Amino acid sequence: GSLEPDGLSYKESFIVRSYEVGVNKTATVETIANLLQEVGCNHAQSVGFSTDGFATTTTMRLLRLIWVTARMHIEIYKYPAWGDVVEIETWCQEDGKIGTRRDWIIKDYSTGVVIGRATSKWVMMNQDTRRLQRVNDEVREEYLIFCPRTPRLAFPEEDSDSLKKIPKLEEPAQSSKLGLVPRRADLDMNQHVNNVTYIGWVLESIPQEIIDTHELQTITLDYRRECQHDDIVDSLSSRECQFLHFLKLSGSGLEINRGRTQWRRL
Amino acid sequence: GSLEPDGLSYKESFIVRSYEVGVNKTATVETIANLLQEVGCNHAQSVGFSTDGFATTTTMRLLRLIWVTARMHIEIYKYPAWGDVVEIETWCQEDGKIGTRRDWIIKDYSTGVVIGRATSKWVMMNQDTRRLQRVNDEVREEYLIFCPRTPRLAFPEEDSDSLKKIPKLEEPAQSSKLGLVPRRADLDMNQHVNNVTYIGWVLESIPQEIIDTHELQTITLDYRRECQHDDIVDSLSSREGECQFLHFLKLSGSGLEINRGRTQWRRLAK
Numbered sequence: 001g002s003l004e005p006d007g008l009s010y011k012e013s014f015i016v017r018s019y020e021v022g023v024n025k026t027a028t029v030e031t032i033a034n035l036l037q038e039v040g041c042n043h044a045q046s047v048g049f050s051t052d053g054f055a056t057t058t059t060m061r062l063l064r065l066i067w068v069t070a071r072m073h074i075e076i077y078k079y080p081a082w083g084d085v086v087e088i089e090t091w092c093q094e095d096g097k098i099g100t101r102r103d104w105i106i107k108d109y110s111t112g113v114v115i116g117r118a119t120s121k122w123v124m125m126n127q128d129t130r131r132l133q134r135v136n137d138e139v140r141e142e143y144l145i146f147c148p149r150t151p152r153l154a155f156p157e158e159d160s161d162s163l164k165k166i167p168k169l170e171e172p173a174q175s176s177k178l179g180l181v182p183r184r185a186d187l188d189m190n191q192h193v194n195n196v197t198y199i200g201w202v203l204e205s206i207p208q209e210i211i212d213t214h215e216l217q218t219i220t221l222d223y224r225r226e227c228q229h230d231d232i233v234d235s236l237s238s239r240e241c242q243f244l245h246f247l248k249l250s251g252s253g254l255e256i257n258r259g260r261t262q263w264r265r266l
Numbered sequence: 267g268s269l270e271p272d273g274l275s276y277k278e279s280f281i282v283r284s285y286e287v288g289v290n291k292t293a294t295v296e297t298i299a300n301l302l303q304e305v306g307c308n309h310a311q312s313v314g315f316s317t318d319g320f321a322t323t324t325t326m327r328l329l330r331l332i333w334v335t336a337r338m339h340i341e342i343y344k345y346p347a348w349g350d351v352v353e354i355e356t357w358c359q360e361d362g363k364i365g366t367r368r369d370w371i372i373k374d375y376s377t378g379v380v381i382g383r384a385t386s387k388w389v390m391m392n393q394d395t396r397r398l399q400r401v402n403d404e405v406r407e408e409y410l411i412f413c414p415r416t417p418r419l420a421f422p423e424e425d426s427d428s429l430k431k432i433p434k435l436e437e438p439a440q441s442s443k444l445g446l447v448p449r450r451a452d453l454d455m456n457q458h459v460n461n462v463t464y465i466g467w468v469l470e471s472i473p474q475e476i477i478d479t480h481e482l483q484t485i486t487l488d489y490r491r492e493c494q495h496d497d498i499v500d501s502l503s504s505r506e507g508e509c510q511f512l513h514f515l516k517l518s519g520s521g522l523e524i525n526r527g528r529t530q531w532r533r534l535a536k
């Protein structure tokens with residue numbers, strides 16, 4: 001991968017691997033999420049920010065601040081097959097004083113056709129208090145200098161599904177997987193359940209009949225809390241075809257995340 | 267990747283990704299196993315065998331025969347870091363009347379140094395009866411044409427750890443992770459727990475104190491049974507600047523053996 005000529009976006013290509021495809025003989029949602037993370041990490045490295053998954057500047061590390069996910073939204077028009085080459089372009093934009101947006105466009109490298117797009121909201125959190133913390137414009141300029149000046153939106157449409165609020169589904173959920181436990185292999189380099197594990201947990205709540213007849217066009221997650229190594233999680237869904245999702249701690253009922261998935265017939 | 271000029275081995279390169287590394291800031295055992303599977307599958311495709319995970323010839327499909335894993339052995343000298351390019355060469359050999367061997371050599375592409383190696387034993391099973399089978403000469407000839415005539419060994423040493431028998435550890439096990447359940451994400455394209463999931467389950471049984479101070483140099487798994495979507499598994503280990511563990515994967519209800527293993531560990535000094 002490489003910064004673009006203007007230095008305000010980053011591009012990387014991948015050849016889809018046989019083990020990265022699922023039941024529909026195309027790349028899994030988890031593979032797509034992993035590729036989005038990979039090009040984002042290579043972009044952070046290329047502009048001199050942390051590569052630890054907090055993507056920090058010098059001054060954020062001084063101020064005990066880290067970037068954390070508020071929302072992730074992925075839309076897939078066509079899943080690539082084993083051996084397909086995909087090119088992902090990614091860039092960041094200001095999202096108010098508290099936040100940044102990271103966007104991605106996924107192309108079939110051979111045709112140049114857009115096969116998917118994604119957007120994410122990040123907020124600045126004090127690592128000691130877990131509170132959102134605003135910093136002055138001079139700290140923000142450290143990262144805003146690596147973002148396009150003129151807005152580039154992967155989701156330029158007026159009332160984008162990517163910004164649509166997710167309500168809390170009412171129990172009992174129509175579909176549920178109770179008592180899910182993270183594995184060592186599910187933990188990031190900070191002992192928190194990684195994003196691909198949340199995606200897997202969300203998909204566990206989908207009825208098999210849907211998995212057998214449909215594929216996922218969009219997934220939206222709003223994150224509230226991290227899941228710890230010893231946490232036990234219930235993954236719930238109901239129809240809102242479209243589903244609402246809710247991930248909650250088995251004991252307390254405390255919200256981990258909520259989500260929306262949209263499905264298209266195979 | 268690509269067949270080599272002589273058409274008797276296959277080579278593929280990979281750039282290690284940020285998400286493929288674990289606590290030691292180098293590629294996980296799971297990533298290595300995935301790369302070994304990937305170059306094996308690309309090789310099968312390049313010689314016109316099935317890519318469904320059974321690597322069948324024309325005559326095997328006629329006879330309702332599939333390759334299944336009896337043993338997998340991985341040895342890692344050095345795990346590659348994020349951004350390292352690794353090149354894996356793989357090839358197959360006849361393994362007596364009982365089956366075939368697939369071997370791999372893993373090189374750091376930058377230096378050309380061997381950083382690891384792997385071997386696997388496969389046996390022929392009738393996919394309807396689950397009964398093992400000695401290989402017909404018709405099936406033998408269909409694959410032997412794609413194998414070196416003089417055997418190449420990734421493990422050419424005398425009394426290789428790769429061929430060492432694994433005993434059944436005695437219960438109670440020193441260390442255990444009970445009631446492991448496969449996820450949809452852990453299923454192969456035939457609804458069976460995939461190989462990387464077994465490796466992960468084996469490593470769940472290792473004490474955290476070992477994970478914190480050592481890294482894995484070798485893993486050996488002997489496979490007995492496939493784990494189904496609704497199966498619940500217990501992962502057991504006991505001890506057997508170096509340390510070794512016996513492993514046993516068994517069904518929670520019946521106690522039936524899924525697989526057994528051995529892992530060998532090396533102390534990290536930094």
Ligand SMILES: Cc1ccsc1C1=NO[C@@]2(CCN(Cc3c(F)cccc3F)C2=O)C1
Nearest residue numbers: 040043044053055067092100102122143146
């Ligand atoms: C994709 C990913 C995985 C872990 S954190 C994360 C992030 N995605 O978006 C963020 C928000 C700010 N930022 C820094 C940053 C710029 F602000 C501008 C240009 C390059 C650059 F790295 C990010 O990378 C965090």
Ligand SMILES: Cc1ccsc1C1=NO[C@@]2(CCN(Cc3c(F)cccc3F)C2=O)C1
Nearest residue numbers: 306309310319321333358366368388409412
């Ligand atoms: C690596 C892997 C993942 C799923 S099944 C599998 C196999 N690895 O070894 C086997 C044994 C036979 N065989 C066919 C074969 C040759 F016999 C010779 C040359 C190329 C070639 F594909 C294999 O690939 C099965």
